[PDB]
Amino acid sequence: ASKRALVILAKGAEEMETVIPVDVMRRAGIKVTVAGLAGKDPVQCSRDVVICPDASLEDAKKEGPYDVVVLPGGNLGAQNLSESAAVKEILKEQENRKGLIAAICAGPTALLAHEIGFGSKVTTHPLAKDKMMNGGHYTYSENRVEKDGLILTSRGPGTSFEFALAIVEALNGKEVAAQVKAPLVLK
Numbered sequence: 739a740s741k742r743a744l745v746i747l748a749k750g751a752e753e754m755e756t757v758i759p760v761d762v763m764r765r766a767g768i769k770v771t772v773a774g775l776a777g778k779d780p781v782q783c784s785r786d787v788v789i790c791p792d793a794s795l796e797d798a799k800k801e802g803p804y805d806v807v808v809l810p811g812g813n814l815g816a817q818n819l820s821e822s823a824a825v826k827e828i829l830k831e832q833e834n835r836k837g838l839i840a841a842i843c844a845g846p847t848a849l850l851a852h853e854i855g856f857g858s859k860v861t862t863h864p865l866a867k868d869k870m871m872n873g874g875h876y877t878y879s880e881n882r883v884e885k886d887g888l889i890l891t892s893r894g895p896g897t898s899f900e901f902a903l904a905i906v907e908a909l910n911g912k913e914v915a916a917q918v919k920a921p922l923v924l925k
């Protein structure tokens with residue numbers, strides 16, 4: 739049947755880093771659940787775009803497992819993910835079940851907070867590098883997208899299409915990723 743993604747949407751999330759992965763995954767035929775960290779109520783993003791979640795995280799985490807857990811960035815959004823006991827338990831489980839975790843821009847700092855994928859090669863946004871590398875628990879990469887086994891990281895809004903297509907390729911293969919890429923008019 740279809741592959742399944744969980745996108746965790748926290749107050750202060752980067753809206754582009756949220757919507758690009760959600761839309762590109764849905765174009766690939768992935769069943770995506772946009773799950774509000776704080777419940778099912780609309781979420782105010784970093785630039786004040788308000789997105790209505792499909793479900794609360796409390797509900798969506800009962801409808802697992804998921805083929806991928808997706809962590810957008812945003813300074814406050816990543817801080818909120820990093821502080822959530824609920825997110826820690828979901829990432830821990832995903833890691834334990836050899837499930838893909840994907841985090842973009844500041845999003846990877848929530849991996850550090852929840853002690854997820856220690857020893858992985860990761861990228862982040864340049865401004866999040868010092869936070870991510872505090873305590874030297876990862877190897878740093880300048881790749882626009884970095885995939886080290888089941889830890890997939892990316893750098894910013896401008897790598898969001900590459901990040902999303904890398905998730906599609908990982909879940910559905912090269913051919914589906916090429917079909918979704920074709921009408922996007924990427925450079």
Ligand SMILES: *C(=N)N1CC[C@@H](C(=O)Nc2nc3c(s2)CN(C(=O)CN[NH2+]N)CC3)C1
Nearest residue numbers: 752811812813842843844845863865866869
């Ligand atoms: C991509 N989503 N992002 C969000 C804005 C930019 C970014 O990473 N900005 C940051 N500002 C700070 C960061 S990352 C790290 N930081 C701390 O986490 C220190 N205390 N821990 N939360 C200071 C501000 C790219």
